Specification:
homodimer, alpha+beta, 11-stranded antiparallel β-sheet, 32% helix, 20% strand, TsiV (chain A)
């Protein structure tokens, strides 16, 4: 009596906004929120073990918390030296106070969520995963900041998340990054819920998939390359040069629909007037992402390993060959680019003062 | 739908998916038969005998006849005004494509729960190796509940006449007869939550390169194996010894067998596991003759990869089969004269 309304919803639109925990399993849904569609940004950066970067991370959180304070509910920390792995947001110490108890050899682990239950996925997120000084010196030097706001918040305040992403890039000088639609999964039960993400990924080419903090220091991530484009795409100056330089990119990305934000030592590219889940009735790939992916696929990772854990009892998981194929989901033939340029101009809203920051080039 | 009528009382459109408004899909009991020689006069008469039999049940409910580019008449015809099927077919030759889709949808583009659909390959297509035609037919779920032997009788009778290669019957969504390329299957959801449902459009699968092996796409409530497939699965004796006669019935015809898995068709299992116990046991017995790939069913390669995954949705670990059999024997209704044909082996 319960699968039918979901079968009807899935047949007519690509996405699900909220997904019950363990839904894409044979044992079936459980009494928690396993996944929530939101607007998420992911930044891979270095020197998280240093005081200046930690202070900048705290300034990032101050900026985020001004928006998110009414909604945050839980702080998760991995094996903290003081306190508990799980703390109610009301009971937490200021982030600057917790960082002040740490030195360069401590691991940064802070995940603020907005789920009603601590097990629930929530649409507000601020997640720091910071490598220890000795880990960075032994070669595992890449840290991750991920943060998100709800889709409804984005529609009501269309410049707020974008301003955060640029402000954070400016302070952290990241190696690479992206922002757009993604599912936040349950902080504790995500293994139940990766199949929901995998099912959605096949339907929504604009969706980011996977866990950046697990990807960050794999051998597959060593090349000077990027995982994906999305609504926002961040390239440090080295990746920008490998992509042909800023002049060569602006020649391929019409300024009617693409904006460029030069922060210090890199650029953020905005692909379209808003983030895109999918395309149209003819093609599920978003036209602005297709054009940007075409310009940047020369610097895309050939493989990043598996995006998900292994399958237990027949459930869907983006592993091995399927993960490699996911990386290529936006690729088109060179000969089809003019048609995609035409689709951009005829069907997609233009950039204006309501959906870009004034500091765009 | 523990109590389907009770569920429809609270959600009248529970079995429908909306499609300028039309019914895009309706859940029903559908049989699919893949057979050869549709271009020959002997088989064409057999198809007309099949429709004669279907029409005795469906005549009050059929509304439309769809035909793709007919040499005589129009693509759409009101059912009340159609010619006899034999006379339309009499106007056709070896090399004409058989295309007849009778539906019960209220509007012409509405999916209907009653269906009789012929897709017959041309003689020259058959000679080039694209020789597999499809007959699909369906009745509403509520009709099956009140007349539980009628669809089953049709499926066996049609199998006898057509001597199919392979086939299956059970729950499926009938789609709109003209807007049949606008809604995503959602194969991974079906595999997880409604694993008893068939998924796909048989006439598009029949002559793909993926279908050429001597294999089957799926088990369902009814599963049809020609004798070649039966032998590859280890033979009928061993199947009957492995599958409890309390819950599995076997119907023989001149060229193969139809297996009935359970007292009625199953959408899903129970609260603990969505896989229906009778289908789990039969899938385990037959997975050695299942297609390994099918292509996509009803976009990047991830949608086709999902379709290959859907083929395995009933698989369980071998160590669990004894527990599944105990669950079948203790929890599931058994077969008797109320839900099987008397001709069962």
């Amino acid at each position: 009596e319960q699968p039918f309304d979901l079968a009807a919803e899935l047949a007519k639109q690509p996405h699900l906004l909220e997904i019950a925990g363990n839904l894409l399993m044979k044992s079936g849904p459980e009494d928690y929120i396993g996944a929530v569609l939101c607007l998420r940004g992911t930044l891979y950066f270095k020197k998280a073990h240093t005081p200046l970067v930690r202070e900048s991370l705290c300034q990032c959180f101050d900026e985020f918390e001004r928006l998110a304070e009414p909604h945050l509910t839980w702080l998760w920390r991995e094996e903290p030296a003081q306190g508990k792995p799980l703390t109610a947001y009301r009971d937490t110490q200021p982030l600057r106070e917790m960082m002040g108890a740490m030195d360069e050899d401590d691991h940064l682990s802070f995940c603020y969520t907005s789920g009603k239950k601590s097990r629930d996925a929530g649409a507000w997120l601020f997640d720091i995963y910071g490598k220890r000084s000795w880990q960075a010196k032994m070669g595992h030097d890449l840290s991750v900041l991920e943060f998100s706001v709800p889709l409804l918040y984005q529609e009501r305040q269309p410049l707020d998340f974008l301003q955060l992403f640029i402000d954070f890039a400016r302070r952290l000088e990241p190696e690479q990054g992206y922002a757009g639609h993604a599912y936040n999964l349950s902080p504790t039960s995500w293994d139940n819920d990766e199949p929901s993400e995998a099912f959605m990924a096949a339907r929504m080419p604009g969706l980011d998939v996977g866990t950046a903090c697990l990807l960050a220091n794999t051998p597959e991530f060593k090349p000077t390359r990027i995982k994906t484009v999305s609504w926002l795409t961040l390239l440090n100056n080295e990746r920008l040069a490998l992509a042909g330089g800023l002049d060569a990119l602006r020649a391929q990305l019409p300024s009617s629909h693409f904006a460029f934000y030069r922060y210090g030592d890199g650029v953020v590219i905005q692909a379209g007037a808003y983030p895109y889940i999918a395309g149209d009735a003819e093609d599920s790939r978003p036209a602005p992402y297709v054009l940007l992916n075409h310009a940047l696929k020369g610097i895309r990772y050939e493989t990043i390993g598996s995006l998900h854990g292994g399958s237990h009892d027949g459930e869907l998981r983006l592993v091995g060959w399927a993960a490699d194929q996911w990386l290529k989901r936006l690729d088109v033939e060179d000969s089809e680019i003019p048609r995609w340029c035409d689709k951009l101009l005829s069907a997609e809203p233009y950039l204006d003062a309501t959906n870009t920051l004034p500091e765009r080039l």
